[PDB]
Design a binder for this molecule. Structure first.
Ligand code: LMN
Ligand code: 3PE
Ligand code: 3PE
Ligand code: 3PE
Lengths: 93, 178
């Protein structure tokens, strides 16, 4: 309980860092959209923890239910080219 | 005037120039085309780190040195500092006319900067908007932005000096007979 339940906020922070890195590093941009959905669930978790569960539900309703759906709809209909993360392209940064 | 500590201030400048050159090298490495790795950033830097470091050293050291030697603070010190900085930057041309041109013209531009106050924004307290202006009152000393109808002749004699028409007494009064 206490040990886990005290650091729930810290766990959400760590998961958010990891989810952002996974968004940027995803091979398939659809997988990137899914990791964006994961980040939004984590944000809803944080908002519940600080007392704003209504904003948790609103974020789930609008950003996942509407915006992420439009994202997926568009990437399905459209022909997107993407390159993979690599040293040759990205270690220079 | 109490002296600048030329050595410590110049060392600070060395650090800042090295940092700024490192940042410029990183940006140069990210913005360029062609293959680029993490070690090529200094390989293909163009010597930009040296530009930054050398300019920092030259300007700060020369400025502090000239200020301490003259025991003044004014635009001339910035003229000397700009001269040295232009010398550093014009050394890269490897040509004597260009080296001289950088020296004198950077020195002149930085002297112009130092003469205006050596700042990019304003010294608000000294500005005309924040200063006594208009016509002075009864017998007050005239300040920089104030205007009078007559100045004291003693002030004129002090400022211009005696000679070529400037005299402590008007001529007709002095040559009056009795
Ligand atoms: C056509 C060619 C144009 C290029 C020439 C322009 C050069 C401008 C220079 C002149 C001027 C602006 C005048 C603006 C007038 C209109 C502007 C003209 C158009 C501008 C395009 C800037 O004077 C600057 O000169 C620099 C030295 O070169 C200084 O550099 C720095 O020095 C060190 C800091 O302490 C640092 O170490 C470092 O930061 C720099 O080293 C500056 O701090 C200084 O402010 C002078 O303004 C000022 O004058 C003084 C006393 O004169 C006035 O106060 C007076 O107080 C008593 C005495 O104090 C008097 O008893 C009293 O009576 C009077 O109240 C002020 O009220 C103020 O008005
Ligand atoms: C940890 C980050 C998020 C933190 C908590 C999660 C927040 C809530 C998540 C909501 C669930 C919906 C969104 C889930 C994100 C989708 C994950 C994903 O991107 O899966 C697709 C991806 C496929 O990529 P792939 O080509 O197979 O990579 C191979 C590399 N050699 O596969 C992968 O990239 C790796 C395999 C993923 C397997 C996912 C298994 C869990 C499935 C969801 C279960 C939800 C809970 C039930 C009490
Ligand atoms: C550690 C703490 C100490 C360090 C603190 C010092 C901070 C300064 C660091 C600045 C680094 C230099 C930035 C830079 O790299 O600029 C280069 C970039 C493109 O330049 P580049 O591609 O290398 O060459 C093109 C030549 N035709 O050009 C750019 O696009 C950058 C745009 C300019 C940067 C903004 C600075 C605004 C101030 C400009 C001063 C204007 C002069 C006014 C007087
Ligand atoms: C058409 C094109 C025409 C454009 C005209 C030329 C534009 C300017 C060209 C570049 C000029 C650069 C001038 C650098 C001046 C160097 C300097 O440090 O000036 C400071 C000097 C004294 O300043 P101060 O601190 O008040 O000393 C009081 C002691 N009496 O201030 C001075 O006393 C004046 C020193 C320079 C005299 C004027 C130079 C010519 C203008």
């Amino acid at each position: 309980m206490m040990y886990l339940t005290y650091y729930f906020i810290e766990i959400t922070i760590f998961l958010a860092i990891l989810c952002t890195i996974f968004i940027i590093s995803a091979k398939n941009p659809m997988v990137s959209i899914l990791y964006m959905i994961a980040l939004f669930v984590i944000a809803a978790m944080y908002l519940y923890l600080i007392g704003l569960g209504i904003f948790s539900l609103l974020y789930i309703m609008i950003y996942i239910g509407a915006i992420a759906v439009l994202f997926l709809f568009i990437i399905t209909l459209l022909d997107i080219n993407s390159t993979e993360l690599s040293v040759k392209s990205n270690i220079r940064d | 005037f109490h002296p600048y500590n030329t050595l410590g201030l110049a060392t600070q400048s060395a650090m800042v120039g090295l940092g700024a050159g490192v940042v410029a090298a990183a940006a140069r490495n990210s913005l360029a085309t062609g293959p680029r790795n993490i070690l090529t950033t200094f390989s293909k830097s163009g010597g930009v780190v040296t530009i930054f470091t050398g300019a920092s050293i030259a300007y700060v050291f020369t400025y502090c040195s000239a200020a301490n030697l003259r025991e003044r603070k004014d635009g001339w010190n910035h003229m000397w500092a700009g001269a040295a900085t232009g010398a550093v930057l014009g050394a890269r041309t490897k040509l004597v006319p260009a080296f001289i041109g950088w020296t004198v013209l950077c020195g002149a531009a930085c002297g112009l900067f130092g003469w205006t106050g050596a700042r990019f924004n304003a010294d608000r307290k000294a500005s005309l908007e924040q200063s006594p202006k208009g016509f002075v009152q009864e017998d007050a000393h005239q300040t920089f932005w104030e205007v009078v109808h007559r100045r004291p002749l003693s002030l004129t004699v002090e400022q211009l000096g005696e000679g070529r028409g400037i005299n402590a007494v008007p001529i007709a009064t002095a040559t009056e007979a009795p």
